[PDB]
C-alpha cells in the first residue's frame, strides 16, 4: 500500500505546478476527471490561478472499457486544455478522454495524474510519483476500506463507527 | 438545385419511420446534430412516439474537420440509439457523432439522415432519397440566400424585405 | 375546436415573429429553445434572422395519465454562461404561461442583460403575454411537430397522412 | 482574524455532516456539488456515505476588482433529472446563504423529492442555517483549496508552503 496524506498530495500538486511553469504550459482550460481527478483539478486549479474548469464524467468498472456518461463543457476549440486525473493505472481512461477532448478542437490535450502505476498504457504528460504499490487516496480511503477493512489507514474506527448505523438505515 | 417542401420532408420523414419499424430499430433515445438535425429529430420522435431526445453541438466549417462544441446527453449505457441529422454530404459528420456517442457504450448506435449525397463517405442506415443536386432544406433557405439571393425559393421577398430592415439595425 | 396550423401558417408565425423583434430592434444574442415544442420555432428564427447561437432547456408540464404535476419540471438545462447577454425564449405556445414563467426565472438567474419571452400562439387565459407572440388562439392547437401524439390520444382528429399513420401506428403497438 | 483549517479539520467536518446524515436519516440519492468550493467536501462525503450519484452546479459570487455583482450568478448547471429524488445541496461555506438559496431555488425546479443543504462552515449573519453543517464560525475562512487564491489577494496571511508558492506565482507573474 500506498497512502499519501494530504501534505503528500500537497506536494504532489505542487510538482505538477512546478512542471507546467518549469515547462511553459499554462492552460486556458482545466477537464476534471470524474470525480477522482476532482480534487486535484481543484488544488491545481487554486495553486496556478487557473478559473476555468470543466468536467467529464466517466468511469472504469472493475466493464472492458471506461464508459463517458456526461461531458460538462462549453466549446474547447483553441484552447489550451489540461486534462486532470488522480491516477494512471492502466491508462484506458486518460486515453479514452484525450480522445474524446480532441474532438472539441482545442489548441493542445495535455495530461497531468498525481501518481502513474508502472503497467500504464500511457504516460501522463506530467506525473508526481510513479507507484507500484496500492494507493489509497484521501477521497477513496472508504471504498477501500468497504472493500478491505484490513486496510492501515487512519479514522478507520470513527468510519467503521458510521458505516454500522449506516448499514442499518438503508437496506 | 432540390428544395424540399414541408410536405416532402414529412414524407422522408415517415418513409424513415417506416423503414426503422419495418426493420425492428425502435430507439430508447434519439440524438439530434444540432442544428440540421434539430426539425428531423423532432419529427421522427412524435411520429413514432420516441420520448427522449438529447442533442449534440458539432459544427462542419465550410475548418478541416467537423468540431464538437458540446454534448448534451446523460448516461446512454445499454441503450438503443439513433443519430439522426438533415443531410449527410460528406459523412464527416455523422461519423465524428457515431464515434463519440460509442464512447458513451450504448447498446447500438444507429444512423438516419433524410438526404443522402453520392460521396459521402458514410452512408446513413436510414434515409429517404439520394441527391446528387444542392439542397435547400425549409430550415436553412435563407442562410442559402444571404449566400446567393438568385436560388429560387418562395417567400423570398418577405425575408429579402426583413433582412434589409435587418442589416440596417445592426453593423 | 382545434387550430391545427399548416407549415405555411408557421413560417408565417416565425416571420412575423422576426418583424417584430427588428421591429423593436430586439436582437438576440442567444436564443433559448424551449424544449421539444420550441425546437421546430427556434431553428426556423436562427435561420430568418441570421442568429447563430442557441441554447436549449429540457423542461415539462406533466398532464398525462398517471403522471400529472401541477407545474412545469425542469429536466435538464443545456447551457453556457449567459451573462450580459440578449436571451430571447422561443416556444410554440403559451397556453398557462407556467413554462415561459419558470423558463423566464431560471434564465435570469445566468443573469443576462435581458430576458424577452416569443411563443407563436397565445391562450386568452395565460398569466402573461409574451413579449413577442404571432396569434392568440383559444381553440387547442395541434402543431406539425405534435400531430401524431394528438391522433394517438386522440384518433378522430382531422389530420393529413391519417391511414399512413395508423398502419405504421399499428405495427408499432404490435412490436411489443 | 481568518479561519484556517487543517486538512484534518475538513475530514473532521465531512465526518461531522456524515454522521448529522445518518442520525436524522436523510441519506440522499444525490449530491449536488456547487463549484468550486464545494467540490472537495462533496467529493469526500460520496466517499464517506458511498453516495455514487454526484451533480455540479457552476455558481458564483463576484466580489473583485471590476467585477462585482450583488448576487451570486447561475453560469451553467450540470445535471440530469432530479425528480423525485433526495438531494443533499453540498459547499463549503455559507455566508450570506445568497449561493445555498440560489441553487436550493433552481434544484426545487427539477422537482425533486427533497433538497436539503449542507455547508461545512456557516456565519453568524447567514440569512439562512443550512439544513446540516460542521461549525458556526465569524471569521473569514481561508480553505485548503483556495489558500494560494487568498496569498495572492493577501500575502501577508500565515499560511504553510509559503515560499514555495511566492517562487512559482514569480515565474508566473513574469510569463505574461
Ligand atoms: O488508467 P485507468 O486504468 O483507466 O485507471 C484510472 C481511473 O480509474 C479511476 O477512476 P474510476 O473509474 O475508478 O472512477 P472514479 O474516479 O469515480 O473513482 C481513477 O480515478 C482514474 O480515473
Ligand atoms: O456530412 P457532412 O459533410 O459533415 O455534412 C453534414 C452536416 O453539415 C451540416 O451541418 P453544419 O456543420 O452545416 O451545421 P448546422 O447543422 O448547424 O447547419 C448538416 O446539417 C450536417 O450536419
Ligand atoms: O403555458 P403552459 O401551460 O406552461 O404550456 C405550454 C407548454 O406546454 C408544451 O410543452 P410540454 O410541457 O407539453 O412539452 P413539449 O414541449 O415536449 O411538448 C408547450 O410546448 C409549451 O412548452
Ligand atoms: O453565502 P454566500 O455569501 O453566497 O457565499 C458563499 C459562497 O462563496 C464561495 O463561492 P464563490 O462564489 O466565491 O465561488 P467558488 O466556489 O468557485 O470559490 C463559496 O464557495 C460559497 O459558494
Ligand atoms: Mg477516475
Ligand atoms: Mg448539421
Ligand atoms: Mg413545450
Ligand atoms: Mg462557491
Same mark, same amino acid.
Given at each position: ?5 494530504? @501534505?503528500?498530495i500537497?506536494?504532489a500538486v505542487? /510538482?505538477? &505546478?512546478?512542471a507546467?511553469?518549469?515547462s ?10 470524474l470525480?477522482?481527478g $476532482?480534487i486535484?483539478?481543484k488544488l *491545481?486549479? @487554486?495553486?496556478?490561478d *487557473?478559473?476555468?474548469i #470543466?468536467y467529464?464524467? $466517466?468511469?472504469?468498472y472493475?466493464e /472492458?472499457?471506461?464508459?463517458?456518461? /456526461? ?7 483553441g484552447?489550451?486544455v489540461? =486534462?486532470?486525473?488522480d491516477?494512471?493505472?492502466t &491508462?484506458?481512461?486518460l486515453?479514452?478522454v /484525450? ?9 493542445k490535450v495535455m495530461?497531468?495524474?498525481l501518481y502513474?502505476?508502472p !503497467?500504464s498504457?500511457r $504516460?501522463?504528460?506530467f506525473?508526481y510519483?510513479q507507484?507500484?504499490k !496500492?494507493?489509497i487516496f484521501? !477521497?477513496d480511503? !472508504?471504498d477501500v =476500506?468497504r472493500?478491505?477493512s484490513? +486496510?492501515? +489507514?487512519?479514522?478507520?474506527? #470513527? ?5 454500522n448505523?449506516?448499514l442499518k438505515?438503508?437496506?
Amino acid at each position: 500500500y500506498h497512502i499519501p496524506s494530504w @501534505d503528500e498530495i500537497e506536494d504532489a500538486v505542487f /510538482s505538477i &505546478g512546478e512542471a507546467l511553469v518549469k515547462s511553459n504550459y499554462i492552460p486556458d482550460v482545466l477537464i476534471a476527471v470524474l470525480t477522482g481527478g $476532482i480534487i486535484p483539478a481543484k488544488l *491545481l486549479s @487554486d495553486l496556478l490561478d *487557473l478559473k476555468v474548469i #470543466r468536467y467529464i464524467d $466517466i468511469k472504469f468498472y472493475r466493464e /472492458s472499457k471506461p464508459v463517458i456518461r /456526461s461531458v460538462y463543457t462549453d466549446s474547447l476549440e483553441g484552447k489550451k486544455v489540461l =486534462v486532470v486525473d488522480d491516477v494512471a493505472d492502466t &491508462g484506458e481512461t486518460l486515453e479514452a478522454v /484525450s480522445n474524446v477532448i480532441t474532438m472539441f478542437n482545442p489548441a493542445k490535450v495535455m495530461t497531468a495524474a498525481l501518481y502513474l502505476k508502472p !503497467w500504464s498504457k500511457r $504516460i501522463p504528460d506530467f506525473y508526481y510519483k510513479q507507484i507500484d504499490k !496500492w494507493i489509497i487516496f484521501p !477521497w477513496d480511503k !472508504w471504498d477501500v =476500506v468497504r472493500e478491505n477493512s484490513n +486496510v492501515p +489507514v487512519d479514522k478507520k474506527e #470513527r468510519f467503521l463507527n458510521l458505516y454500522n448505523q449506516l448499514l442499518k438505515i438503508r437496506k
